[PDB]
Amino acid sequence: CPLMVKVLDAVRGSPAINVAVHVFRKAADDTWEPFASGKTSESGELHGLTTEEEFVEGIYKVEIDTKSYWKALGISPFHEHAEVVFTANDSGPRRYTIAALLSPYSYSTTAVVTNP
Amino acid sequence: CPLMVKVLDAVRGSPAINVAVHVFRKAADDTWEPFASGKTSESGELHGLTTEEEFVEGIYKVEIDTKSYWKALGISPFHEHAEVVFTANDSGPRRYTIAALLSPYSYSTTAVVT
Amino acid sequence: CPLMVKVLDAVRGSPAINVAVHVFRKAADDTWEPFASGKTSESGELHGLTTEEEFVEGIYKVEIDTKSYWKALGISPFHEHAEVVFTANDSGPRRYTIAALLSPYSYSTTAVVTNP
Amino acid sequence: CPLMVKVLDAVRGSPAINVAVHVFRKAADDTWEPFASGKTSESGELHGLTTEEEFVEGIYKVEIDTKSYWKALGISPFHEHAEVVFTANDSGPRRYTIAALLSPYSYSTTAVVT
Ligand SMILES: Oc1cc(O)cc(/C=C/c2ccc(O)c(O)c2)c1
Numbered sequence: 107c108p109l110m111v112k113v114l115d116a117v118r119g120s121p122a123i124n125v126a127v128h129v130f131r132k133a134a135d136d137t138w139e140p141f142a143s144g145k146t147s148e149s150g151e152l153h154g155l156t157t158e159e160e161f162v163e164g165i166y167k168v169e170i171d172t173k174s175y176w177k178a179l180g181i182s183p184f185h186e187h188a189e190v191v192f193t194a195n196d197s198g199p200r201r202y203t204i205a206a207l208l209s210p211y212s213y214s215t216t217a218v219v220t221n222p
Numbered sequence: 223c224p225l226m227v228k229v230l231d232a233v234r235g236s237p238a239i240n241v242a243v244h245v246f247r248k249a250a251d252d253t254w255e256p257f258a259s260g261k262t263s264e265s266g267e268l269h270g271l272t273t274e275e276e277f278v279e280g281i282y283k284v285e286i287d288t289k290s291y292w293k294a295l296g297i298s299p300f301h302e303h304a305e306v307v308f309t310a311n312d313s314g315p316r317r318y319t320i321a322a323l324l325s326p327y328s329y330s331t332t333a334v335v336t
Numbered sequence: 337c338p339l340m341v342k343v344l345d346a347v348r349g350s351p352a353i354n355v356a357v358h359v360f361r362k363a364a365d366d367t368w369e370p371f372a373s374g375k376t377s378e379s380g381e382l383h384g385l386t387t388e389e390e391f392v393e394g395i396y397k398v399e400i401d402t403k404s405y406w407k408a409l410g411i412s413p414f415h416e417h418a419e420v421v422f423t424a425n426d427s428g429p430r431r432y433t434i435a436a437l438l439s440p441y442s443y444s445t446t447a448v449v450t451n452p
Numbered sequence: 453c454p455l456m457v458k459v460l461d462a463v464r465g466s467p468a469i470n471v472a473v474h475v476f477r478k479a480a481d482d483t484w485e486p487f488a489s490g491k492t493s494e495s496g497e498l499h500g501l502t503t504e505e506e507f508v509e510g511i512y513k514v515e516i517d518t519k520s521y522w523k524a525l526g527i528s529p530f531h532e533h534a535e536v537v538f539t540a541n542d543s544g545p546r547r548y549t550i551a552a553l554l555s556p557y558s559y560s561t562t563a564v565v566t
């Protein structure tokens with residue numbers, strides 16, 4: 107899987123389930139074009155967003171709808187969303203895992219990049 | 223100081239000095255309009271971005287040019303930038319500190335609202 | 337697997353491979369008794385530390401030898417190790433994932449606790 | 453101030469106030485001897501733990517009583533405490549800030565050495 111997203115909840119010590127994720131790619135005209143979307147599973151993971159053929163060099167944005175997640179739990183959170191912007195595949199195809207660890211007033215994110 | 227930004231470097235254990243920070247506010251047309259900018263000081267801090275009168279309720283984005291910071295240290299980083307998007311002052315002025323802890327492939331951010 | 341450890345490297349964007357992990361359990365006399373040890377695999381994961389029968393209620397410490405890891409990469413790090421101390425299984429058996437994200441002067445850790 | 457501790461709360465977006473902090477130094481017999489302690493202030497900070505003369509090279513542990521903090525807010529936390537173990541001053545005095553960002557099932561810590 108060339109792009110996978112994993113989301114964890116630091117308040118409950120659980121995967122963050124049913125979180126909406128939207129991925130965009132920067133187009134020739136410098137606008138964000140929709141690329142893929144989905145929701146995290148019971149394991150906090152979102153697989154199957156793209157394929158190796160479609161996931162070309164470019165600048166991508168992964169936007170995680172953290173606000174809806176916290177509001178459904180009864181918490182008014184600080185951020186509107188958590189997003190990650192990165193260049194992908196500029197030295198050839200790679201596999202990317204984007205992980206995010208969420209709290210109401212904080213988030214942490216890391217990337218794991220592997221060469222298949 | 224209604225809005226302060228503090229940036230720390232997790233590789234060197236130091237403030238992140240001379241990092242460019244741009245602040246935007248969301249305009250009626252769902253576009254990001256420039257609002258303030260600066261570069262962090264020797265303590266990793268950026269003060270004096272705005273005043274209580276100008277800092278009204280709304281949606282703000284703080285964008286930190288992390289890529290230029292790591293390139294200057296000879297490290298190839300993952301992110302194009304680190305950004306933080308939040309609603310402020312929806313219930314009137316407050317004091318906001320946005321902190322960011324940087325590594326080449328990761329960042330953490332928190333808000334201290336007092 | 338009742339106890340799994342996952343270790344990631346925030347400098348290189350990779351799993352932290354070959355990291356030593358030592359687990360201890362607090363004994364009746366308030367000393368730390370050795371419980372299990374291992375090293376992380378190529379995926380940054382350490383499985384097979386214990387079994388459901390051996391992993392009883394108690395206070396456990398997971399100690400990750402981050403110092404050796406960074407020194408092998410040429411970096412003199414701040415911490416002597418990263419450790420996590422927690423009570424386990426006090427409301428019945430659970431499955432624990434302890435994750436750590438490492439940098440030379442910082443670490444983050446989270447737990448994911450699931451009810452099998 | 454050669455050693456300062458700052459503690460932040462990621463759930464409420466605030467300093468972590470009135471948190472107990474104990475500092476230990478490793479003794480010749482590989483035992484932890486008490487060295488300093490205090491509780492964080494309204495800004496989440498603990499100053500005045502030690503002096504330059506007393507703070508010699510060695511191995512120190514900072515232990516933060518996170519469990520009592522979350523219990524006071526009615527949240528059941530994962531960790532017994534958060535602790536940070538490091539070597540100081542091996543090349544003579546420096547100024548150390550140990551920061552910790554707390555959530556019920558997670559903590560992050562960094563050091564700022566200036
Ligand atoms: O920014 C952070 C901070 C942190 O403390 C942990 C993570 C990631 C944890 C993780 C846990 C289980 C996984 O399978 C996985 O891929 C990642 C990310």
Ligand SMILES: Oc1cc(O)cc(/C=C/c2ccc(O)c(O)c2)c1
Pocket residue numbers: 228230321322323330331332442458460549551552553560561562
């Ligand atoms: O492990 C982490 C993660 C993070 O996202 C932030 C911090 C520290 C924030 C901070 C905020 C205000 C201060 O004065 C200060 O010294 C530090 C530490």
